[PDB]
From Swiss-Prot, chain A:
This is Nitric oxide synthase 1. The gene is Nos1. It comes from Rattus norvegicus. Ubiquitinated; mediated by STUB1/CHIP in the presence of Hsp70 and Hsp40 (in vitro). The PDZ domain participates in protein-protein interaction, and is responsible for targeting nNos to synaptic membranes. Mediates interaction with VAC14. Homodimer. Interacts with DLG4 (via N-terminal tandem pair of PDZ domains); the interaction possibly being prevented by the association between NOS1 and CAPON. Forms a ternary complex with CAPON and RASD1. Forms a ternary complex with CAPON and SYN1. Interacts with ZDHHC23. Interacts with NOSIP; which may impair its synaptic location. Interacts with HTR4. Interacts with SLC6A4. Interacts with VAC14. Produces nitric oxide (NO) which is a messenger molecule with diverse functions throughout the body. In the brain and peripheral nervous system, NO displays many properties of a neurotransmitter. Inhibitory transmitter for non-adrenergic and non-cholinergic nerves in the colorectum. Probably has nitrosylase activity and mediates cysteine S-nitrosylation of cytoplasmic target proteins such SRR. Inhibitory transmitter for non-adrenergic and non-cholinergic nerves in the colorectum. Changing residue 280 to F: No decrease in nitric-oxide synthase activity. Isoform N-NOS-1 is expressed in brain and colorectum. Found in the Auerbach's plexus of the enteric nervous system. Isoform PNNOS is expressed in the penis, urethra, prostate, and skeletal muscle, and coexists with the cerebellar nnos in the pelvic plexus, bladder and liver, and is detectable in the cerebellum.
Length: 403, 404
């Protein structure tokens, strides 16, 4: 009736009771599981999400049933009944943002969930103001390499007027320039956004590591272009502890992983621009960004520099080079004194988070395929851990690209 | 778009729609409210409709649907059930059904080979001694001195109130695990229980790290009987590393033949409780899981110490570096010994080819993403980037409760 969840390394068992709090359907049915798919394919409804949320908030501060709790529910009813919508109090927004992170099933970093700096940017009325808020977020989160989790929340969606949006999917990414011969210079994942930036009048570089500008959009306005001050964008040159030639590859990556395309939903309210940042787990850079064939795709280059036999899969040249590239990321971040976490440390801390959440809430939604690192899966404890995936609210959700 | 799941490959950008899932007559463990895809575990009217379905599959596969022979086989099946409560497969129906069960297996990455399976028919078997002879024959044929061949042997089906044929071992070839005075295990900790059952049934145990277990074989309504595999039948590979000379000194080894013996083969509602099957290894199975799982041989630290790695800190990636080398030792050693093996790059490339064959042949392919993606270097292989749809099609292999 409630799922049994087993750890196959330790033989331990728990039952997930939290999943019964889910109000929103995922993509699976009893006929077929779609858990590996990356994306999904009135006033009465909003009123009940708002009440549930408010009840969640008062219970978190152990004031369920208090005067303040009753009056806050009344304010919400009154506001929705007159206007079709309502507004959160700053402390509620702060609580809601932390829960959305807590509830995010694809995030291996959730042991940190209670430590989140929340910037209230709901008094934003222009793309220019958005830029200032974003620059302040970056500065704060970066903190000369001693990275601090942060979210900045721009004004909620409103009925029949356009959304505040950040067109970039990350606050910091590298340009991808489609070339004469159909190869790509830079990050092939960012060709389409790079082309939007130029079409909105950016003067592009021609390097492999050109930091993109921001396209910021205030309601029903053309997006506006803003170049990030280069001193705000902390970057780490990549070199290798023992392989002296690695540095000559001229590789580098940015310190700050900052998501800017997801929608933050709290209490039925939607925040279409609400960028958030933490710190990197080294496999995102070392394995995916640098080694994916449709990304920087450097594996063969590295393996050749290591003089490995590239002619056959069975020499395991790919595996060997992937490991050295990940080590080089860790070492370089450590050398530059910029916060990073390796995939062993991160998954061990995630296991601890599972245990905390089990006692706190009776379960924890997790997407096994996202939680298990892209190299050395079974070498980490999360591989051997069964997981239950489901949608709780508050939530981060994916949304359509604004163009 | 089409009212079927849309399946995307994120490396190549290509899209397909799975229409095959519409054929699934059995529910998995997911609902709209929660995904349970990462969990390792989960009479006349019913039988007849399963039987009719399988026979339609058989006649379809030989392109004779609606044919006079098709309707006659249907009538024959219902009459058998009508008068006996059960029915029996023709020989070519069994060959087809066994290959289809393998084809349908969502967790098997080796399915490009599905059409090439030697089906040994052992539905005449009537004793544990005879099961032993059949199993020994299978092992000999399958191993083929290192040039391995996929094979399954099918013992008589489950029958109305009569005991099952069962092999108690989960695999035909496994190593003993001996519970020690100090609570540790010598050999394979996975196999403590089966090791301890073999002893209770009179096996004289060894005390190595790599002692091949005897077989505990159960004919209908008898206690299981014990059979020692003659050692010259069990091909093993000593492990060495191509450049690390000390690796051979560790005395590690593995057996050639991966042979599952505890799974139930279901075909048209008929249940084959003993139907052991075998192929050849993918190298990560041995080098990553068998040798490096913490709860298995657990050799990662020993190998990292030999490699002189910093095992005191996670960020040295000592675990990753040791695992790679062990995996390389597995591949090198099987290649040297001329024993068929496939690495995880070549296996996953071949499974991508299989997905495209099946897209055209049947409109989809049930696959379990967590099982298909290898346990090291996942995203370096093409399957990591491929969305997959998982559902139960029959014929099927299914897990069964241990007989004890
Ligand atoms: C503090 C350090 C953090 C670490 C080490 C971390 C780790 C990760 C990793 C490795 C992923 C998978 C990323 C990928 O493969 O693309 C991820 C996903 C995610 N994390 Fe975190 N995280 C951190 C902080 C945060 C914060 C502050 C938030 C929000 C406040 C957050 C929310 C999310 C969400 C919503 C996803 C999924 C994004 C998507 O579906 O594309 N995480 N996390
Ligand atoms: C020809 C070479 C083959 C290769 C390389 C191969 C590969 C694999 C691998 C790597 C696994 C996962 C095992 C694990 O993680 O423990 C597996 C599972 C499986 N394979 Fe294959 N396979 C082959 C042949 C076969 C054959 C001949 C059959 C049956 C006729 C089969 C049916 C299955 C089934 C039913 C599973 C799931 C086992 C379970 O759930 O415990 N495969 N295969
Ligand atoms: C199709 C699709 C769906 C989906 N939900 N996400 C994506 C891309 C996800 C993605 C890509 N690059 C980068 C990130 C950033 C992930 C990230 C975020 C944070 C806050 C910390 C951290 N260590 N890592 C996320 C694609
Ligand atoms: C709880 C549980 C459930 C389940 N369905 N399977 C298992 C064990 C699966 C398992 C473990 N070791 C070994 C194998 C053999 C897998 C195997 C089988 C064949 C035929 C070829 C090949 N390369 N590999 C299978 C455990
Ligand atoms: C198809 C598959 O779901 C897709 O490649 C997923 C797999 N696991 C992942 N895991 C993480 N953390 N990030 C990813 O982008 C993906 N991609
Ligand atoms: C918890 C999780 O489902 C479990 O550990 C799975 C993950 N993927 C696997 N994949 C394969 N091929 N074999 C396995 O035993 C497992 N174990
Ligand atoms: Zn599912």
């Amino acid at each position: 009736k409630f799922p049994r969840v087993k750890n196959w390394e330790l033989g331990s068992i728990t039952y997930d009771t939290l999943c019964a709090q889910s109000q929103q359907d995922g993509p699976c049915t009893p006929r077929r599981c779609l858990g590996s798919l990356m994306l999904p394919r009135p006033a009465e409804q909003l009123l009940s999400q708002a009440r549930d949320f408010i009840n969640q908030y008062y219970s978190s501060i152990k004031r369920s049933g208090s005067q303040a709790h009753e009056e806050r529910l009344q304010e919400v009813e009154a506001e929705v009944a007159s206007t079709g919508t309502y507004h959160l109090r700053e402390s509620e927004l702060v609580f809601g943002a932390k829960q959305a992170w807590r509830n995010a099933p694809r995030c291996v970093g959730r042991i940190q969930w209670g430590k989140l700096q929340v910037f209230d940017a709901r008094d934003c009325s222009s793309a220019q103001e958005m830029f200032t808020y974003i620059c302040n977020h970056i500065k704060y989160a970066t903190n000369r390499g001693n990275l601090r989790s942060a979210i900045t929340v721009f004004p909620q969606r409103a009925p029949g007027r356009g959304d505040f949006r950040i067109w970039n999917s990350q606050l910091v990414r590298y340009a991808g320039y489609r070339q004469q011969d159909g190869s790509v210079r830079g990050d092939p994942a960012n060709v389409e956004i790079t082309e939007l930036c130029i079409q909105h009048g950016w003067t592009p570089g021609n390097g492999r590591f050109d930091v993109l500008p921001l396209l910021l959009q205030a309601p029903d306005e053309a997006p506006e272009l803003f170049v990030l001050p280069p001193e705000l964008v902390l970057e780490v040159p990549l070199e290798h502890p023992t392989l002296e030639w690695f540095a000559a590859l001229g590789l580098r990556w940015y310190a700050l992983p900052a998501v800017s395309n997801m929608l933050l939903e709290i209490g039925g309210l939607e925040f279409s621009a609400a960028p958030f940042s933490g710190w990197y787990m080294s496999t995102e850079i070392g394995t995916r960004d640098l080694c994916d064939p449709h990304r920087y795709n450097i594996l063969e280059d590295v393996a050749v520099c290591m003089d490995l036999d590239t002619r056959t899969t069975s020499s395991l040249w790919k595996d060997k080079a992937a490991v050295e590239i990940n080590l080089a990321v860790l070492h370089s971040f450590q050398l530059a004194k910029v916060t990073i976490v390796d995939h062993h440390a991160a998954t061990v801390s995630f296991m601890k988070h599972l245990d905390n959440e089990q006692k706190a809430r009776g379960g924890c939604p997790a997407d096994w395929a996202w939680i298990v690192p892209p190299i050395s899966g079974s070498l980490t404890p999360v591989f051997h851990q069964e997981m239950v995936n489901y949608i709780l609210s508050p939530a981060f959700r994916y949304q359509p690209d604004p163009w």
